[PDB]
Amino acid sequence: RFTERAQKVLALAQEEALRLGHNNIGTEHILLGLVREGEGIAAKALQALGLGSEKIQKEVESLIGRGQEMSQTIHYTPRAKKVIELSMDEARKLGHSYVGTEHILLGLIREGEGVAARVLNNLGVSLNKARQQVLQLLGSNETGS
Ligand SMILES: N=C(NCCC[C@H](N)C(=O)O)NP(=O)(O)O
Numbered sequence: 001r002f003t004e005r006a007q008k009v010l011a012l013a014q015e016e017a018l019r020l021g022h023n024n025i026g027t028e029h030i031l032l033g034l035v036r037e038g039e040g041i042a043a044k045a046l047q048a049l050g051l052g053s054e055k056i057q058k059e060v061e062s063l064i065g066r067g068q069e070m071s072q073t074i075h076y077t078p079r080a081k082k083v084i085e086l087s088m089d090e091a092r093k094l095g096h097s098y099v100g101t102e103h104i105l106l107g108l109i110r111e112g113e114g115v116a117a118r119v120l121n122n123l124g125v126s127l128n129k130a131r132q133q134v135l136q137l138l139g140s141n142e143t144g145s
């Protein structure tokens with residue numbers, strides 16, 4: 001149901017929430033996981049849009065701050081859960097049986113709210129346009145399992 005690289009993104013989302021001392025796995029950690037996974041279609045699409053790993057790291061830490069103490073427990077936020085649910089819908093609508101990193105990215109953009117939306121807004125990203133651009137990239141490339 002998830003590609004191998006989508007599984008890596010979900011691991012890195014949790015990794016980053018712990019590393020930063022946060023008790024939630026939110027949309028901002030999903031975004032960090034997408035860019036830091038560094039190999040999947042989402043990382044390549046984010047990079048094509050001028051959204052690099054170090055920039056996103058700086059924005060999250062600036063907007064939220066660090067917990068100065070690695071967190072003890074971590075649970076997904078309601079919005080992050082909705083992003084993952086939307087990623088399954090996005091994969092379906094594109095004719096994919098497996099949810100890839102790009103479908104998590106499209107779900108995040110489609111949700112269009114939460115901390116990740118503020119990070120993207122700080123980098124001058126219009127979510128509608130980014131959605132259009134991601135879909136243009138997927139329509140230009142073979143991305144099947
Ligand atoms: N860090 C967050 N959310 C904080 C938790 C929401 C909080 N319980 C509340 O009062 O809303 N990121 P996201 O974009 O919501 O996933």
Ligand SMILES: N=C(NCCC[C@H](N)C(=O)O)NP(=O)(O)O
Nearest residue numbers: 003004005040041100101143145
């Ligand atoms: N569309 C993809 N990957 C192509 C298929 C990956 C393969 N189904 C697999 O099971 O890993 N996106 P991602 O960036 O690799 O998630």
